[PDB]
Design a protein around this ligand. Structure first.
Ligand code: MG
Ligand code: MG
Ligand code: MG
Lengths: 48, 141, 358, 82, 69, 202, 82
RNA sequence: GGAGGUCAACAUCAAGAACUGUGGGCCUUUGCCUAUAGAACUUAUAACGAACAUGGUUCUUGCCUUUUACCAGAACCAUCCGGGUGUUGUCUCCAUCCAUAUUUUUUGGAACUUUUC
RNA sequence: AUAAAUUUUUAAG
């Protein structure tokens, strides 16, 4: 959605949430348990 | 033409530009175009995740929401003499087809089933690999 | 299976159940002596659509739903005698396997034009000719081809002996009381108290007591056909028939090896055809998996390949398969919390389903 | 293409009346019509130019020899014209 | 352009009402886009048959009213 | 709560073809038909019905501005709750309208959508067993496949009249990106691949 | 090889689609494409222990207008005054 | 008169899948039925914001000397940072459809004479 | 044949 349009309206510069997309997607693989648990916090705060 | 005016609302752009933007922002973008990817990562599999008190393995954990499960009669219906274990029933069943595997849900939602199994095929190597090209992923017909 | 959560609400459930049977045609419903209700439906999603529409619209009451189960059936593969409970009568029944291409035929219901076979539903199509369909196609006894009486869902009854020919008239009396008793013990079952399937019944001979009687025989004879058919099935080396879904799968190509595992795991474990697809990086994969193992299956696929792929199960050809075990063992191994060993699958399901009814 | 032709086609099914060059009116269910008004009709009465009437089954008529066709007034409403 | 749909009337006896207040009868054998009729012969309407088979020109036909249903 | 719907007599859409006249067509059995529509999952069916609808009713309530010009499909005959959020179709569902062939001969038509999952075939078997002719909708990419088989044996087995429509050609180019030629070759490959199941008919 | 390869499969697949061939040639022909989208190490497998930069290699100059020099003189032995 | 404004005021934005005006019939204004015209904005993986906080009451917990301050779930409400559309006002910058004649149409089989009324 | 990870402090008596 951010992109394909080419016609649309502004957003208050703090509404674009740049980093939401990363913690939606899977954790990937490598990361040590610190960052995975960081993900779970970001979900829990989102869903809520 | 490009933008509205000093009050600066309703930007109006053009393909070549919006391309170049696409190009740049490549570090910062979600990049995944197949809805069928998020399978249990949509919302509703989260809400189901909570409300039944499960945890998708990569999932956010929440609170019981219906905390006291401990009340129970000693009751023959679901018992062991009468039940056959063939396949385990992992959770993701219970989050995938909620009303079925899970006796007695409360406040559950509708998982959305599935999408078309995207075929999308992109050619990202060459700038000059032309638009329409028979791509080795395809079968020969 | 179904039970409503609190006993005092049994009525409300019923008042919805009848509704559902109407609104969703496909479903088929049952009770038992148990008070359990039984809900038979097409496929897993279909059970979902129901049970949701059961709880959140028609009946509102929460209920307890079992682990997904399956149907079964009762077949057999080969002095012989039987008795009445008040020794004025007796029956003894012959039972055999039937042609896989016969039973194949019946479950395909057909108009039989051309040089083709015909289905049994039209049995009042030319009866002698009908025996020509039989003699001709099925290698059927021309004398039984004479003697064929009457058919039911998956199987059919026949007659062989002289004291038949003592009273083909006096039996021409009790034909349609027997055809009941046959439907009777067919719909029910010896082991699972579940429908019998694919069996040939050639009667031995029917002793009727001296002077017969008026209303003794009438409804005296049908249950005696119950013990008749059963007794005829037992010594015939029974087995237990399990359905088989005809799997369809679609994948991107390089993800194929993945599928192999699943099937190796799910015991359906036959993928018959890998059909390349044209112009699109897909593989149709046609396969089979039994119903009982198919429980979560479609997810196991849909996940394990990370969003590419899809699956569907379904039942058309109405194929069946023997379940591997030895249909009775006193020495059997029953796991208690693990999937049983295939040296007895069937003994298990007997001693379970019987522990549902009793 | 001709809008009268279209109208005629539409009138298929309906009970049309139909006079020829001869002046022999018919009235019947319009079975089939073509670009050339080659009409077929069912259950059709047939008046002579002088007066007398005759019932008949499935008349065919060639548009060349047709004079004018009366269609039912329901077709006035819709939706051929616009 | 389009063919006259007379396949219903094929191999049936028809009253070909023809030019000048005349008539013809006979079983229908064929036709074309001009509505010429080829028919196995019959009388001219007391009555008298001429020919074994007959061909009627398109222009000449007023009507071809079916004798058989 | 349980479904969507319209409950009133004055908000039902205007329906540009003047209903009562449609009811006039309804007299002759000759001019009306029953078209059932079936295919495999996600083959475009309900969408297609909605092509007919939005092409028929003049001003719809259920359009948001979104699908009006937009992106998400207005899926009109869907109408339940379950069939909405589940994202699917369960109870087969009708729509009637009169519409014109190119002739301008405008026939009354009963369309009936049918579910495309293979655990709902039951509620297609109805849609056949009633309906007069059926459109089997083939999704070009998927190509025909065991489900389209058992369909077409089930259509013609019950003595119905079929027409095929190849669907979702956006997926042809704008995803697969198949040079024009090889695409033509593909369509041919389907057609050849279907005629082997429609035997005495081509 | 990227262009040349590409146009080689231009004509090569162009074969299977437009042409009409034998069975046992065609089956193999498509086994090619299959292992292609399975990436070829079924056909590429070997001894890789040698380096492109380190190992002194010689890129030979031939072109199909070359008669290879057809040397049977180096085929047989001489007298060595050395 | 046109373009704009990091300008203002006043309306309207969560619902029977849902708005409004009008003609006609009935009851007796409401209301029901019928006909007709017009519907910006926002809604179906449901919504004004592909964003994301705080407070109050009430229960269930969790830390556990007591209270502020708190741990994490629910119900019912509130506040706050923002938004769209419409009308009016004001300000700034500029201007005063084939082309052609041999069976279905348009290259005619039309005319003359006579009776009845 | 496993990828399952709670917390965290200031004032007043
Ligand atoms: Mg649909
Ligand atoms: Mg003190
Ligand atoms: Mg104190």
């Amino acid at each position: 959605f951010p992109f394909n349009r080419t016609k649309g309206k502004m957003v208050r510069a703090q509404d674009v949430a740049l980093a939401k997309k990363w913690f939606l997607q899977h954790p990937d693989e490598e990361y040590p348990v610190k960052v995975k648990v960081s993900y779970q916090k970001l979900l829990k705060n989102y869903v809520l | 033409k490009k933008v509205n005016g000093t009050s600066y609302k309703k930007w109006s752009f053009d393909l070549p530009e919006m391309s170049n933007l696409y190009r740049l922002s490549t570090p910062l973008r979600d990049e995944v175009t197949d809805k069928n990817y998020y399978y249990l990562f949509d919302k509703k599999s989260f809400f189901n995740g909570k409300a039944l008190n499960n945890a998708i393995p990569g999932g956010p954990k929440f609170e019981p929401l219906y905390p006291r499960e401990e009340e129970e009669d000693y009751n023959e219906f679901n018992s062991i003499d009468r039940v056959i274990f063939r396949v385990p029933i992992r959770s993701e069943y219970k989050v995938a087809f909620p009303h079925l595997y899970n006796s007695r849900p409360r406040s559950v939602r509708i998982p959305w089933y599935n999408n078309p199994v995207s075929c999308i095929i992109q050619n990202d190597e060459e700038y000059d690999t032309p638009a329409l090209f028979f791509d080795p992923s395809l079968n020969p017909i | 299976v179904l039970q409503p959560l609190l006993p005092r609400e049994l009525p409300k459930l019923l008042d919805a159940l009848n509704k559902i049977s109407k609104y969703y045609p496909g479903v088929i419903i049952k009770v038992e002596e148990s008070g359990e209700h039984v809900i038979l439906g097409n496929g897993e999603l279909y059970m979902d659509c129901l049970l949701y529409d059961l709880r959140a619209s028609y009946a509102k009451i929460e209920i307890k739903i079992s682990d997904p189960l399956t149907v079964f059936s009762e077949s057999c593969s080969n002095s012989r005698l039987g008795e009445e409970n008040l020794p004025g009568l007796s029956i003894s029944v012959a039972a055999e396997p039937m042609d896989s291409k016969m039973i194949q035929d019946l479950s395909r219901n057909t108009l039989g034009k051309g040089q083709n076979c015909l289905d049994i539903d039209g049995i009042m199509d030319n009866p002698r000719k009908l025996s020509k369909i039989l003699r001709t196609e099925y290698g059927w006894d021309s004398l039984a081809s004479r003697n064929v009486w009457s058919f039911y869902n998956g199987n059919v009854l026949i007659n062989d002996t002289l004291p038949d020919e003592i009273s083909p008239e006096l039996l021409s009396k009790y034909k349609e009381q027997i055809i009941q008793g046959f439907y009777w013990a067919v719909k029910e079952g010896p082991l699972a108290e579940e429908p019998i399937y694919g069996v040939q019944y050639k009667l031995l001979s029917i002793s009727v007591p001296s002077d017969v009687n008026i209303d003794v025989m009438k409804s005296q004879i049908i249950p005696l056909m119950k013990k008749a058919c059963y007794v005829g099935l037992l010594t015939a080396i029974p087995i237990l028939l399990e359905p088989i879904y005809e799997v369809d799968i679609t994948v991107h190509a390089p993800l194929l090896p993945i599928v192999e595992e699943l099937m190796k795991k799910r015991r359906g474990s036959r993928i018959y055809k890998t059909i390349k697809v044209a112009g699109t990086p897909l593989l149709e994969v046609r396969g089979q998996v039994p119903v009982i193992e198919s429980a979560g299956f479609e997810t196991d696929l849909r996940l394990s390949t990370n969003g590419l792929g899809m699956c569907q199960l379904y039942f058309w050809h109405k194929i069946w398969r023997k379940v591997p075990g030895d249909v009775l063992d006193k020495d059997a191994f029953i796991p208690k919390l693990k999937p049983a060993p295939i040296n007895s699958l069937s003994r298990d399901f007997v001693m379970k389903t019987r522990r549902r009814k009793g | 293409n001709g809008i009268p032709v279209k109208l005629l086609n539409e009138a298929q099914g309906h009970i049309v009346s139909l006079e020829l060059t001869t002046g022999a009116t018919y009235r019947g269910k319009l079975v089939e019509s073509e670009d050339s008004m080659n009409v077929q009709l069912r259950d059709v009465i047939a008046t002579e130019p002088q007066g007398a009437v005759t019932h008949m089954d499935q008349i065919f008529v060639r548009g060349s020899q047709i004079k004018f066709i009366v269609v039912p007034d329901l077709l006035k409403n819709a939706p051929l014209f616009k | 352009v389009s063919t006259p749909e007379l396949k219903k009337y094929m191999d049936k006896k028809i009253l070909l009402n023809i030019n000048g207040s005349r008539k013809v009868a006979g079983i229908l054998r064929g036709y074309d886009i001009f509505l010429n009729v080829v028919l196995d012969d019959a009388m001219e309407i007391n009555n008298h048959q001429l020919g074994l088979q007959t061909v009627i020109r398109g222009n000449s036909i007023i009507s071809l009213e079916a004798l058989d249903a | 709560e349980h479904t969507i719907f319209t409950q009133l007599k004055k908000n039902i859409p205007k329906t540009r073809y003047n209903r009562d006249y449609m009811l006039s067509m309804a007299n002759i059995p000759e001019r009306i038909i029953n078209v059932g529509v079936i295919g495999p999952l996600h083959s475009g069916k309900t969408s297609l019905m909605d092509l007919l609808v939005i092409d028929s009713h003049k001003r719809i309530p259920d359009m948001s501005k979104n699908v009006e010009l937009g992106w998400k499909p207005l899926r009109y005959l869907d109408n339940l709750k379950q069939e909405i959020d589940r994202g699917l179709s369960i109870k087969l569902n009708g729509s009637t309208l009169l519409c014109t062939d190119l002739e301008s001969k405008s026939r009354m038509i009963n369309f009936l959508d049918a579910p495309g999952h293979v655990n709902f075939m039951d509620e297609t078997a109805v849609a056949l067993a009633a309906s007069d002719l059926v459109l089997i909708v083939i999704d070009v990419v998927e190509g025909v496949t065991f489900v389209v088989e058992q369909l077409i044996k089930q259509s013609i087995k019950n003595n119905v009249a079929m027409c095929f429509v190849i669907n979702k050609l956006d997926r042809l180019i704008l995803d697969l990106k198949l040079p024009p030629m090889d695409a033509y070759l593909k369509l041919n490959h389907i057609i050849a691949n279907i005629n082997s199941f429609t035997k005495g008919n081509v | 090889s990227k262009k040349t390869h590409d146009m080689i499969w231009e004509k090569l697949r162009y074969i299977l689609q437009t042409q009409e061939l034998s069975s046992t040639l065609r089956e193999s022909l498509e086994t090619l494409f299959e292992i292609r989208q399975k990436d070829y190490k079924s056909g590429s497998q070997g001894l890789f222990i040698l380096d492109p930069t380190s190992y002194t290699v010689h890129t030979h100059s031939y072109i199909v207008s070359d008669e290879d020099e057809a040397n049977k003189e180096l085929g047989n032995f001489e007298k060595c005054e050395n």
